[PDB]
Structure formats: C-alpha cells, structure tokens
Symmetry: D2
Subunit: 319 residues, 4 copies
C-alpha cells in the first residue's frame, strides 16, 4: 500500500493508543517543511524581480516553524538556532512537548544553491514547573522523535522514533510526503570521509592521524573517497544512505566544536543510533551529554559503526 507521512504517523499513534498530541505536532511540522521547501525552490521569485511591476529564507523558515508549532497546541517550549532565548508557548496554546530546531541549516551559503535543511528534536516536558528554557536542557537520550528535512535535488523528510528511521519523499505535485525507504539501517562500514580539510593546520593529532589513514591505508585496502558539501543535513543524509563517517571535531581553537548540541548534534545522533550508527564527541555519545546552555556547542563524529569505532581507537591512542 502507498503510505504517506500523514497516514504513517496517525497509524503509529493509534498503535500507541495516544491522545493525538504528537501527531498534531508532526502534522504541523510537516506543513511548515512543505512551505519552507516551496520558498527554497524560489516559487514566486518572479514577483520579487518585478513581474507585476521579501524576507530572507532563514527568517521566513524560522517564522514558518515557530507559527506552525505554536498553533499545533502540542508544544510548550521552543528552541531555535535563530533565537537567543527559548520561546515559551502562551498558555492557551500549550501542549506537553519541547522542540529544538534549526529552521534552515546551511543557509549561510544558500547564495550558491547548496542543499539546505531543517533539523528538529522533540522532547516531552519533564518538570511540573511553569514552562521555561530549563525544560530544553535534556540529554538526547530523552528524545521522543527527531529527524530532518533535506531540500536537495528533491525534498525528503527523515523521521526517527523508537520504531526506527523512515524516509519520505515530497511529491510537490500533490504536497504529500511518500514513504520510500522503511526502517532504514546504515552500512556497518563505509568508504567516504567527510570534513573540512582546509582547517588542517588546527586539527587535533588524532584527527590528523585518522584522516591520514583514510587516504594512506596501512593494510593495503582502498583509500576512502572524500565528500564535504558543507551543509550538515546534506552531508549527514549522504552518510546515512551510503555509509561512511562525518566529522566536525573539537580542536585547539574550538575545544567544544562548532555545531550546536541541542538542534544539530542531538537529532543527527538520534537518527544515526536508531539506524544502527554511532555519534560521539570523542569522549562520549552525543546523546549522553547533559547540556547547560541551549546554544552550547559539541564536537561530533558520526556514521557507520566500524568507522566511528576506528576513529575512537585513534582518539584513545592519543590518550
């Protein structure tokens, strides 16, 4: 049977005999993603260039996600890459869920038409206190659901829950996300490594060693290929589909990495683990870091389990 994201989520909700709140949240999120996708592909750009005689895409995308989530009545605390403090849903619209999201990841270079994406992680509120920013300071282990939308050659929604990872293709002719890849698992070992090698002068020695081994294998195996889009959603999705490893590690100038834990690293780590992959800071699983600031950064190395394990050995070899 054909399956849509709408039908899939609804049926998962009936199996769990839930109240319908999480289904409303996800339906609302899916609608924002379709609207973001439409704007990213530049529908209506003729009007901006005067065909009949405005907001940047990252601002518009943040507005789309914020309003659809607020009006879902399913959320109470919202953290966005775009906002310094967490948004507290007003009382009449409050639900039980906390959502951390990056509304248009990779948009800083969208002038070159690079792939971009939306990343989200969804938690249930743990305290009975009045909702506050503190409710977003949970470890990734507490995620109820996470995933991303990739606006690439086509638009795809990847949704991870306890049931596994499922991939839905947006058919723009009808505005429906079509389930095309069920219960996805990552390869045990890949053949692609992904990081910005231009910063080689600042690499940690374990990172230097690991990359040198990918290019000059000591066991006479074939050297890995290299890919680095520079858009996390695009690089991470390719890692899921083809296997391999993705690194944005800590270094001398950036002991905490550059990517953001709450709405970049935690969702991608959760997608990876539900797909049989791994995601580490070097010191521990990304999902086990207990955050103290909603915008705090984290190092991240993620992907096929054999590859992440090989990186960790090199990291531990350097103490």
């Amino acid at each position: 049977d054909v399956n849509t994201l709408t039908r899939f989520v609804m049926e998962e909700g009936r199996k769990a005999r839930g109240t319908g709140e999480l289904t409303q949240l996800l339906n609302s999120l899916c609608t924002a993603v379709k609207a973001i996708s439409s704007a990213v592909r530049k529908a209506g750009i003729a009007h901006l260039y005067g065909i009949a005689g405005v907001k940047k895409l990252d601002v518009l995308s943040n507005d789309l996600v914020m309003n659809m989530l607020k009006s879902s009545f399913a959320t109470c605390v919202l953290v966005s890459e775009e906002d310094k403090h967490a948004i507290i849903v007003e009382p009449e619209k409050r639900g039980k869920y906390v959502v951390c999201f990056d509304p248009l990841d990779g948009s800083s270079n969208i002038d070159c038409l690079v792939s971009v994406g939306t990343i989200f992680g969804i938690y249930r509120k743990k305290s009975t206190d009045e909702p506050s920013e503190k409710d977003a300071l949970q470890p990734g282990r507490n995620l109820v659901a996470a995933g991303y939308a990739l606006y690439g050659s086509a638009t795809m929604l990847v949704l991870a829950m306890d049931c596994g990872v499922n991939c839905f293709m947006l058919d723009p002719a009808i505005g429906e996300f079509i389930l095309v890849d069920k219960d996805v698992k990552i390869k045990k070992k890949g053949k692609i490594y992904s990081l910005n090698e231009g910063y080689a002068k600042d690499f940690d020695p374990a990172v230097t060693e690991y990359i040198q081994r990918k290019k000059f294998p000591p066991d006479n195996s074939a050297p890995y290929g290299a890919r680095y889009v520079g858009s996390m959603v695009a690089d991470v999705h390719r890692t899921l589909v083809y296997g391999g490893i993705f690194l944005y590690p800590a270094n001398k100038k950036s002991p905490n990495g550059k990517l953001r834990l709450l709405y970049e690293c935690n969702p991608m780590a959760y997608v990876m683990e539900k797909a049989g992959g791994m995601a580490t800071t070097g010191k521990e699983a990304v999902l086990d870091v207990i955050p103290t600031d909603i915008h705090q950064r984290a190092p991240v190395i993620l992907g096929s389990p054999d590859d992440v394990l090989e990186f960790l050995k090199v990291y531990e070899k350097h103490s």
Copy 2:
C-alpha cells in the same frame, strides 16, 4: 524591468539579426531543463508508489527529443550515448550540441545536487553531418552553460555577450534573469577537489593543496568544499570564487571528467566570467579532441587561484 530567459535570448537573437535558429534551439533546451527539473524534484513520484493502485534515461530522452524537434541541430553528443546521434534530414539544422543530461546522477540516491551541462557549436561545412563535426576545440563554442538542480533550479548561460544567470520560478515555469553579466572574484578562499586521491596526486597538486592549508604569505587557510557533483562545485566557484580541481590520478591519468560536455562548457563559462580553466599544460578550450568521450584534467576558477596553481605546476616542470 523583469527579464525572462525566453525574452533575453530572443532579444539577443534580434540584435545579431540571426535567422532565429539558435533562439529556437535555446528555447527547446530551456523546455527540456524545466522538464528535467520537475522529474528531479520527484513530481508525480506518488504514482510510482501506487497511489492509484531511469532518471538519467528520461533526462537524456527529454534533451534529445527537444533538440531534434527544434529543427536547429544536426549532431547530438550525450554522455549517455556511445556514438553521436545524427538528426534525420527532415529535422536537421546547423548546430552541434554536446551535453551531459543529468551530471552527478550516480549518487542521486542521496539527493545530491545534480545538473545538466551543454555546449553548442555551429557546423560550418556542407558535408553530410557526422560525429566528426563534434570534434571541435572549445574555442569554437557559440554558447554553453548548465542548469543546476540544487536548493533551487538555476540556468547559467554563457555567450559572447557574457554570463547570465536565470532562476527557475516553479510557480510559473519561468526562468527569471537574476544575475547579469556575471564576473568571478579575482581571488577566492575555497578549494574544491577529492582529497581521497592524495596518494595518487601529482607532485604539483600535493604542494598546491599544502599551500591552501599552510599559506606562505601568512594569510588565512582556505576552506574546503567538495560536493562531488561537477555542476554544484563549479557553480559555487562562480558565485563565491575559488578553485575547482579534477586532476589526473592512477585511475584517471587523463583526468576523469569529459572534455566535450563537462570540461569545455565549464571552461567557456569560466572564461566568459573573467576566470580561467587549464589542463595544466594548456587552456581546456584549446584542446583539440579526437574522441567525443575523451577525458581531460581540469583546474578552473578565480584567475589568481588558477595562476597560483600554474606557478606550482611549472615549478614541477
């Protein structure tokens, strides 16, 4: 005033007082590109998954059929076809078109940016058309460019008048002129190549890359980007400046990318925008091909960056 690709091409054609043949060719290609874009964004994919109870082939078929029916072409060379296609006499025009209909498609399973690359030559002789009519150096190009199917779809068209960039508005199926007479930065800060082949790198490439990470003039090290889809990496080079490299390695001693419908169109776009494109030994556009599918090494982009590579290259003789 707003400008469309259709209106722009028509008006250029009226300026040259041409017969309208090239305008018809370019119009047909523009239609093919919009149809490819629609398929790449997966419009109608629900029908494939049973709602009512191949992409590189379709892309080739779209370009082939639109160019044939334009009545403007006589010889068509595609990455997909072993031999050149000869247009039947009743639909034969005077132009020769080399194209890559869905460049980067080998990895489209991960939704990487993909694109269509095309180069257009005029056939001058009165001989019966043949594959040999496509064996021209890039210097002979009448027009070239690409369509990038990335976060949005854009057509970049280079001609004698320069380089112009048109954004596809999917709401009305119109390419809107958004960047006129584009020129590349004199010098950039991003280098682009597959460093997985480092063990097989030519000594000049190894040193040049070392200069990007550890600059000799105490400048900041370049960032690295490599999408692995030639159209995406080359378009970023155009917009942000910098350098793109696909040099020879052990698996590809003449490089990997194809001269006729990958390197030459991109070399032409680069040169019309104030950039450079070299094999190391000569300008790509000066290579005289002997095989429609022959490969070439290519280093292209901002002029200061390519000149810096060439200095390193000449240092290794």
Copy 3:
C-alpha cells in the same frame, strides 16, 4: 491561527475522543482530491504529447478507490464509475461506507468546464457480511459529506455535525487552508439554476415557478440565471451566493437525472447543515430510502425561502 484540513479534522476527532478511524478516512480522501486536482489541471500532459519522444474519470476513480481501501477505514465503496458496490477485502476492512462521484461533470471536460468530486460517508449499520445493501441507507444517516470543486481554484467543502467548512487548496504546498468557517447559506437568493432546454417537458409546477423568477408577480426584480451544467459548480455557487438549483424529472429522466447516493444526498446534507433545503418535491432528499445504488432522484435545493416558495407552487398543483 491558520488552520489546515489535516489539523481541523484531527481536532474534531480529539474532541469526539474517537479511535482515529474516521480521521484516517478523511486524510486519505484529502490525498486523493489533491491527486485528482493535479491531474485535472493537466500536470504532466506534456509527456502525453511526446515531450520525451488512464482517462481522467478512470484515474480519478482509481485514486479515490485505492486511497480509501488502503485507509483501513472502509468496507463498502459505491462509485459512479462501477456498476456494483466494491467490497473491501477482509484484511483492509473498516467500519465506514463511502458513496462518491470521483469526477462529477467530466462528460463535458472537453470544454474545460468546472468538474468536481462528491462524497458521502456512512457508518455500516448491519452486522451482515459487507454487501451492496450497506450503501442503501437514507442520507439522514450521513456521518459526513461534501465535495471538491476543481474550478478557478480547488476548494474542498466538508460538512459534518459541527457545520460546513470550506478549505482552499494551496497548490504551492499541497495544503487545504480553512477560509470559510461554519458556513450558512443566505435565507433568500437572486439566482435560479436549471437546464431550461427541457422546458417542453417540465411539469406545471416548475413552469410556474420559473415564470415567477422572470416575471415576478410582486413586481420585484427578476432573478438572474446561471447554469454551468456541472452539479458541483452550480451547487457551490448556490451555497456561496444563495438562490436555487433545479434538476427535475423530464421525459428522458422520469425518475430525475442526478444520482441519489453520490450526487443528491451529499449535496442535500451540505445544504441542510448550512441552513438550506433539498427536496424531491414530495419529500426531503435525505429522507428517501434507496433501493438501488445508482438510482436517480429529482432535486430542488438551495436557500430556504426559495425552496419553500417552490414547494408552495408544487402543492398548489397538488
């Protein structure tokens, strides 16, 4: 706050504390209507004319049929396109019965006339093995009904116990946007709608009523006339602007022409939930007890003052 059909239906279901089965049905139907709309607007027609070198009513039927079966919410399906009721296979059976016209008005789609999808939704009432008889319930038993109009824009009108709500399809995002809430028809309109080409066959009551619209005996202004000849388009105008719509019996159609199960009953339900009326002349459309799934009925529907004025003329002629 902005509201979508998906969000609207889900919230009604949470208020009713239902199992989610009817929401699954409606979501599936909403998906089919968007696919029908895309095909009706001729997306992809360039491929049919050879750009790379099913009939619309059949495709529309297949879209509705397959989306409803795979919803797991239906057991019996009646369509204008199928001679007999479709019985949903045992593993996919739900509790609802759906009668629908997948592309109403398609006989003149050659001139690009507005066309539409009409549907009526019942709960299966008998405990017998599902059969064509499960669709022979009077319209009074409808749980939900409505239509999609593929006109200048695509609109879905959904009527339920909570009232009538209208959603505009935004094709940029494949989303039905709530634009008119808890809609009510005007008490009295100024437009009458029927095929006057059958004037020679009209019964005396229709002849008099139409004469009153053109030459009003109180010397008020004559009604204007509109007749698209596509029921969804004419009924939708009647809902939005008021007035009256008539397709009475004639010599070629002595039992009327429109179909009771999936044209007259869904439109009667929308009209009554919007404060309007729908009569055969002898009784409310919704009270007719069907005996055959494709049976026809005469229908007079629209603003309550207008239908009541017609019924007075009808009783005057006995």
Copy 4:
C-alpha cells in the same frame, strides 16, 4: 513532434520573416498568463491566511508590466483602466493591445471559470501614440484570443493561419499544442444566454429562444448552458458548437459586453474558426469604435445557428 506555444509562435514569425517584435509581445503575454493562472489557482494563499504568523488588479498589473517591458507595444487599453495607457517612449513598439485581464472575476468568489481576453493591432498612423490608435475595427486584428482558467488552463490563439489551442502544463510552465487549426461545427445543439432578463428581451430574442425550446418540426430541443463568464461560454461554443448571445434590448441598445476587449477578440476567433459573430445589424468585426469602452451586442457561434438568429431578428426589423 511535441509543440509548445513558444516554439509555435517563433516558427510562424520565421515564416513571415518578421522583425521578431510580435513574437516578443506574445512571449511576454504568455508569461503574464502563466502568472495569472498561478494566482487564480491560489498558489501562496496560505501566507495570506497566516502560515508564517485584488486578483483582477494583480492580473492587470501582470499584463501591463509584461507588455510594457516587451518593447513591442505603444498603446494599451484595458477593461481595468479608465483611459488608454501610453507606453513611455523608450519602451515603445508598434503594436496596440486591448485586453480584459480577468474576465468574469466579479463572481470569482464562487470559483467560476475566469479568463483573459486580448486583441492585438498594428498601429496605423505615425501620430504621437494616443487612445485613438485603439479605435480600429476588429477587421484590423493581427492576433486575438483568450486564456481560460477553468478545470485546466488553456490558451486559444487566433491568427491569419487559423485557431490553435494550447494546454498549460503546470509541472513545467509550458503551453502544449493540443488542438490544431480548429473549426467550429456548422450547427450546434446548445444556446447560451441569461434568461433571467427575459422580460426585457427584444421580441426577436424571445421568439428565437422559444424556437430552441419548442422546435416547430420534429427536431430535438436545444440544451441550455450559461456559466456567466464570457470566456467559459465562448470556449464551450467553440468546442461543442451552438450559439452564445448577449444581445441588445431597449434598456441596453448597445448590449452590455465591451467591443474592444470582449466582443472583437471573440468575434475574430469565431470567424477564424469558420463561425460568425454579429451585432444583429452587422458583423462585430466591422463596427468602427468611437469610445475605447463602448459596448456592442454580440451573437456568435456556429454559422447555421447565427444565420437562423438573424433570420428571426430581421423578421422583427
């Protein structure tokens, strides 16, 4: 071979060996029609209803701006503008365009079919451009037609070569030629007018309509259709044959529809398709206008039906 409106128009222009000015006009109008269709189908309406927290004026702006920026027009007359619009000198071309940007829009609240109607003239004098350049009889038309925004969007284009119908494919923004050199039936079976105004009918209209419903012989009575949107009713008349009437009466001795941008374009399409269009007194196309907004009675459609109406009409004259 597949054919698009863009390719079709270009080829007609190459056969006529023209300067390309009329082709640029038609391309610009086609683009405006795709943008009108997108707004009429309500693309982007979610933003208007607050997803991120007028139509006839927009349609008029779209046509006006695309025609102005074509450099092919000098005088523009629209149903939406009180006076003729004079194109600024630097953008002036040789054509005069009369149009209704969104005919039928007054009832667009009910999602009734709507349309754009246009007629294109060559400027006849060398005088400074003015409203007077639009006061030509329909006989002087170079091109006319309409776009119907119905169940699908179709552009009907009438020229000296005949009437051709192009279906808009929204997936790629291309008008695809689907019905070539179309001719209307000699005689139809449908009559189309607002019978709610029966008490004010001219006696000839009363008798003629009564004959359609109660034929004096053994023929079948005609069916009746009246959408109330001229483009929708005229297009059905073209496809199915029959007759469409908006005739004169004592209270409206000149009819209601407008000669320059409703009656004349539809008359030209009908006559090129082998049909007829009369005021009752003369051919619509032979009326010489004195006012850009003047009205004209119009009876049009299959020639046997129009002649029969004139027989009844002259009996009461």
